[PDB]
Amino acid sequence: VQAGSYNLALSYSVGLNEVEDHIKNYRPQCLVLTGPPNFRPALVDFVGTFTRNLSLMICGHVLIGPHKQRMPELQLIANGHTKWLNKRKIKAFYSDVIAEDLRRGVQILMQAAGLGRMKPNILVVGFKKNWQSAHPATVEDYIGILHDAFDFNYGVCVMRMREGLNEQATTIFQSEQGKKTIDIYWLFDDGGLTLLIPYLLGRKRRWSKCKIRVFVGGQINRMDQERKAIISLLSKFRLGFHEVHILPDINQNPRAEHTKRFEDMIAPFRLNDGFKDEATVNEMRRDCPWKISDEEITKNRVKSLRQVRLNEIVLDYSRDAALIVITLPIGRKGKCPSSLYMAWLETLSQDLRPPVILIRGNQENVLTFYCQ
């Protein structure tokens, strides 16, 4: 029976080659970074919930060790991990690679994982809960992994949960959320990926009863008019979202107590280089690329403050939401040191009861109201 199954799979994979890619037929092609899947099952579950029977879902594990010492273990443990996934009833492909560092292995996976058109277009990673107590090199590597995912047009999906990452353990996602609401903070236009992921989640039996609330930014003067132009774009997409809220007060200065929290949270990583030219900043950067010069802090005052203010708005709306979705701010390479970038991600999702997902598309349309 294996031969016929393999032949069917190969035949259909080959036949998928002539099929062209269409916006109406786009599918989230997920490459979750779980390592050993049993260590971080929650994450897997979530992706499965919206990939089940709908799109491909690969699991990426990077090994640290010579091939010879790993080849036997590689072959005899990949099957164990696959059988664990199957026993958990997930239609995901396990794939492990060996590299000196996690970033290199993730790069090779994103570059080569996939057969033809069934290659991931999204990288689903888990939040680094200990990014402060960890060696700054690790935080720099994680941020660089995000940058690499962007370089490949991979839509990033950073998942943060209060509990953390770590019979099979039961996670919150295997239960039913019920009537709780799904808050989607579509602050910036990522091409719709921030909206498709929660739409597919609600289409599942466990999220059908969730009342999806969409939050957008507007100005206090034209709240009413802007409430309708966005309640109309959602209608054109025919996503079934219930409400549309607007927050003119996102640009107001964060509270004087919370803002200092952000500054004290980035105190250790400050390089204190706010009076020297960029050509005079690199030498004290070679060993410490994560250090944040005072110069870079000045140009990111508004942006850093806005993230703090965003966390204020979310902390007063989604206190009791089943799931929180917030667009992922995009730092610029060469101007957003890993320390500053991680602070935003930490500052964005924090202090609440987060099933928060920080999604961010590749600035390419994934939802269309315009049949060809």
> Among residue numbers 22 through 51, which ones bind a second copy (CB under 8 A)?
22-28
**Bridge partners of 357?**
159, 325
Q: Does 21 bind a second copy (CB under 8 A)?
A: yes
- By CB under 8 A, the residues from 108 to 167 that bind a second copy are 108-109, 111-118, 147, 150-153
Binding piece for a second copy, criterion CB under 8 A, among 255-263, 271-279, 284-292, 329-337: 329-337
In the complex with a second copy, which residue's Cβ is closer, 95 or 132? 95
Crossing angle, helix 338-348 and helix 301-315, to 10 degrees? 20
Question: 356 among the known binding-site residues?
Answer: no
- By CB under 8 A, the residues from 52 to 111 that bind a second copy are 53-56, 58, 67-68, 71-72, 79, 82-83, 85-86, 91-95, 97-98, 108-109, 111
Q: Does 348 bind a second copy (CB under 8 A)?
A: no
Residue 327 C-beta: closest distance to a second copy, Å = 9
9-43 burial code (b ≥16 CB/10 A, e <16): eeeeeeeeeeeeeeeeebbbbbbbbbbebbebbbb
**CA–CA gap between residue 240 and residue 231 (Å, rounded):** 10
Question: 33 among the known binding-site residues?
Answer: yes
Asked if residue 95 lies in contact with residue 59, where contact means CB atoms within 8 angstroms, the answer is yes
Q: Does 344 bind a second copy (CB under 8 A)?
A: no
Residue 259 C-beta: closest distance to a second copy, Å = 15
Nearest to 139 by CA among 297, 304, 288: 288
End-to-end Cα, the chain, rounded Å: 41
* Binder among 43, 159, 239, 340 for a second copy (CB under 8 A): 239
* Binder among 18, 264, 277, 283 for a second copy (CB under 8 A): 18
Question: 146 among the known binding-site residues?
Answer: no
Residue 267 C-beta: closest distance to a second copy, Å = 25
Tokens 């703090």 belong to 308
In the complex with a second copy, which residue's Cβ is closer, 83 or 162? 83
Phi, psi of 296 (to 5 degrees): -60, -25
**CA–CA gap between residue 90 and residue 38 (Å, rounded):** 12
In the complex with a second copy, which residue's Cβ is closer, 27 or 270? 27
In the complex with a second copy, which residue's Cβ is closer, 278 or 351? 278
* Binder among 242, 335, 351, 353 for a second copy (CB under 8 A): 335
Q: Does 225 bind a second copy (CB under 8 A)?
A: no
Q: Does 254 bind a second copy (CB under 8 A)?
A: no
| Number of residues counted as binding a second copy (CB under 8 A) | 106
296: its two tokens: 């870079």
Q: Does 256 bind a second copy (CB under 8 A)?
A: no
Using CA atoms, how far residue 344 sits from 64, 86, 96, 216, 354, in Å, is 30, 37, 30, 19, 16
Using CA atoms, how far residue 220 sits from 210, 223, 246, 250, in Å, is 28, 5, 9, 11
- By CB under 8 A, the residues from 203 to 222 that bind a second copy are 216-221
**CA–CA gap between residue 187 and residue 310 (Å, rounded):** 9
Cα-Cα-Cα-Cα torsion 36, 59, 368, 176, nearest 10 degrees, comes to -40
Binding site members for ATP: 33, 40, 62, 126, 128, 130, 165-166
Q: Which residues are annotated as a binding site?
A: 33, 40, 62, 126, 128, 130, 165-166
